[PDB]
Amino acid sequence: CLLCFTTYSERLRICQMFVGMRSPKLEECEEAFTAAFQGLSDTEINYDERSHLHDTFTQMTHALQELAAAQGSFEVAFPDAAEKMKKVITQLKEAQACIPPCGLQEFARRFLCSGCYSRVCDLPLDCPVQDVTVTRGDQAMFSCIVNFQLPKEEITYSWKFAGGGLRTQDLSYFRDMPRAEGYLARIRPAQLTHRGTFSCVIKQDQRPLARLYFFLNVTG
Ligand SMILES: [Br-]
Ligand SMILES: [Br-]
Ligand SMILES: [Br-]
Ligand SMILES: [Br-]
Ligand SMILES: [Br-]
Ligand SMILES: [Br-]
Ligand SMILES: [Br-]
Ligand SMILES: [Br-]
Ligand SMILES: [Br-]
Ligand SMILES: [Br-]
């Protein structure tokens, strides 16, 4: 995480304060620094903690500066700060676990220090079809509910219908169902012409987080 939360100029300035502006050791110093953090090069942290960690690294830089200004060897200074940061990292709050089988799960997002970028679970947007069997004249209810946490802001539910009795996730068979809004869709009453797949797209603003599918089997 050293490379992600400190810049090359900061690290060069630290090493110069250690050995000198244009010292021949100035190169070795560099490789003592980065190597000292080699173990933390592939850690994954809770995305929501990145700022915190970055701030901590800022503190670290200053702590090193003073250490260099007061003589002090870089050879011991860098492993020391590396272990301090290792403990800081171990005490950070964890992101939520990935929950199968589908969805963009923002509360599971993690920051990868190897590459310095964020990542959610590699799950499909489309969730498995849920079979819902009712009889003619009976009420049917589709709950657009996922098993992972959704953001609070800007969530909408868009419904679609693929008729003709198709059990399908293929979008080319669906038309929009503008009557339906919200997480709960009701067919009152269900009839044979409702046979088909109902889909609900959960969106944050305009980006989809999940697409659910309900195959309504209406029985005579
Ligand atoms: Br940050
Ligand atoms: Br020292
Ligand atoms: Br985590
Ligand atoms: Br939120
Ligand atoms: Br909505
Ligand atoms: Br089918
Ligand atoms: Br449409
Ligand atoms: Br409609
Ligand atoms: Br409702
Ligand atoms: Br979509």
Side-chain angles (χ1 to χ4, degrees), residues 1-24 26-65 67-70 72-85 87-220:
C1 305
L2 179 67
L3 293 190
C4 303
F5 299 118
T6 61
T7 68
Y8 286 89
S9 296
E10 291 172 353
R11 299 194 294 275
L12 180 72
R13 197 178 300 119
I14 271 68
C15 265
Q16 287 172 323
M17 286 174 184
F18 265 104
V19 303
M21 200 74 91
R22 294 151 219 278
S23 154
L26 191 56
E27 176 268 297
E28 285 85 34
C29 184
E30 305 289 45
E31 288 165 12
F33 207 164
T34 58
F37 286 77
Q38 195 63 47
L40 301 173
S41 66
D42 44 51
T43 86
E44 311 182 357
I45 64 161
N46 178 2
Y47 183 76
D48 305 331
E49 289 277 25
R50 70 196 180 283
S51 293
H52 178 199
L53 185 53
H54 202 162
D55 286 337
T56 300
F57 269 92
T58 300
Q59 296 165 46
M60 189 198 63
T61 57
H62 300 337
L64 285 167
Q65 285 179 295
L67 200 170
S73 193
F74 64 88
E75 305 194 25
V76 72
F78 292 152
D80 188 13
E83 222 56 25
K84 162 91 160 45
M85 289 304 317
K87 292 185 207 177
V88 171
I89 293 169
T90 53
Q91 293 300 87
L92 300 172
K93 167 178 292 206
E94 294 160 33
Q96 285 174 42
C98 294
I99 312 166
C102 56
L104 204 168
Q105 308 189 6
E106 279 294 343
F107 289 77
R109 187 176 289 275
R110 280 158 171 82
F111 183 86
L112 315 182
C113 289
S114 134
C116 308
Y117 66 107
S118 73
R119 179 226 86 202
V120 280
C121 324
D122 184 22
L123 295 163
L125 271 172
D126 299 296
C127 307
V129 174
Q130 162 160 95
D131 293 324
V132 179
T133 304
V134 308
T135 88
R136 249 111 117 273
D138 301 5
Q139 174 164 347
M141 193 176 295
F142 307 131
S143 295
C144 193
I145 295 287
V146 297
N147 59 19
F148 57 93
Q149 187 162 336
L150 291 169
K152 287 192 198 168
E153 343 267 2
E154 295 162 318
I155 299 307
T156 59
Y157 301 84
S158 307
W159 291 82
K160 312 185 286 193
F161 177 60
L166 286 199
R167 188 180 187 278
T168 176
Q169 297 173 307
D170 186 315
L171 303 175
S172 73
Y173 296 118
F174 289 83
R175 58 152 175 83
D176 282 354
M177 199 197 325
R179 278 172 63 181
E181 32 185 336
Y183 88 99
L184 213 57
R186 306 171 169 78
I187 320 295
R188 321 185 281 155
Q191 259 295 132
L192 295 173
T193 55
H194 294 111
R195 285 172 303 174
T197 303
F198 293 84
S199 183
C200 165
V201 184
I202 308 178
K203 293 189 183 187
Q204 186 187 27
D205 204 278
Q206 295 309 292
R207 63 143 163 188
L209 304 177
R211 310 207 288 264
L212 280 63
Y213 299 89
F214 307 86
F215 175 60
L216 182 65
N217 200 8
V218 189
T219 72

